[PDB]
Amino acid sequence: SPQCHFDIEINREPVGRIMFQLFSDICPKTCKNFLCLCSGEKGLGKTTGKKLCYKGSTFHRVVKNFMIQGGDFSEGNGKGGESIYGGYFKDENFILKHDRAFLLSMANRGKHTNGSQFFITTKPAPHLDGVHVVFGLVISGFEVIEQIENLKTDAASRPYADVRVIDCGVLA
């Protein structure tokens, strides 16, 4: 099972590393996208012209007791990002359920609109089953997730503080 990490700073304070386990058996296309966004190895986005990489991206949507969301590397507000395939790719499958906290799952705007945005749940969310593709699990950095989850947000659930992926990468 491949692994990859984010190193997080909040307002430039280093707060720790989130380590992900990806389930590339069940969701190979989805995990390959997420992995390549961690290494940045695929270069410039085909529809966005921005680097296909999470490094320097933010968490732009936070809902306490629900989830934290990031990966919009082109707009930082939920409107952007795209996959390594060029624009969006199909919902690979909905085999894995949102049956626990700390799952990694694809953000979307309807069927088959997977790009680069992802979210991490902080509780079971079964109403999302068959809606968002689950492809991974956080296996370390729970305190980081907690910290991000408790940030003050505005009316659009956007954190006021800078929640920054300062580094990220694929593990051996």
Numbering used by the authors: 6 to 177
What is the paper's account of this structure, in its own sentences?
Cyclophilins are peptidyl-prolyl isomerases (PPIases: EC 5.2.1.8) and are characterized by their ability to catalyze the interconversion of cis and trans isomers of proline. In order to understand the molecular basis of these results, we sought structural coverage of the entire human cyclophilin enzymatic class. We determined crystal structures of seven human PPIase domains—PPIC, PPIE, PPIG, PPWD1, PPIL2, NKTR, and SDCCAG-10. The active site of the cyclophilin family includes the invariant catalytic arginine (Arg55) and a highly conserved mixture of hydrophobic, aromatic, and polar residues including Phe60, Met61, Gln63, Ala101, Phe113, Trp121, Leu122, and His126.
In addition, binding of CsA or derivatives was seen for PPIF, PPIG, PPIH, and NKTR. Modeling of either CsA into the active site of a histidine containing isoform (like NKTR) or computational mutation of the Trp121 in a PPIA∶CsA complex structure indicated that similar hydrogen bond distances can exist between the indole moiety of tryptophan or the imidazole ring of histidine and the carbonyl of methylleucine 9 (MLE9) in CsA. Therefore either residue would be competent for binding, as we have shown experimentally. Conversely, a tyrosine modeled in the conformation to coordinate with CsA created a steric clash with the carbonyl of MLE9 (1.75 Å); in addition, there was a close steric conflict with the modeled Tyr residue and Cζ of the highly conserved Phe60 residue that helps form the proline-binding pocket. For instance, the residue that is at position 103 in PPIA varies from alanine in about half of the cyclophilin isoforms to a serine in PPIE, PPIH, and PPIL2; an arginine in PPIG and NKTR; lysine in PPIL6; asparagine in PPIL3 and PPIL4; and glutamine in RANBP2. Indeed, for NKTR there were relatively few tetrapeptide combinations with both favorable predicted binding energy and penetration into the S2 pocket; this is easily rationalized by the extremely narrow gap between the gatekeeper 1 and gatekeeper 3 regions in the NKTR structure, which occlude the S2 pocket and restrict the types of residues that can stably associate with the pocket without steric or charge clashes.
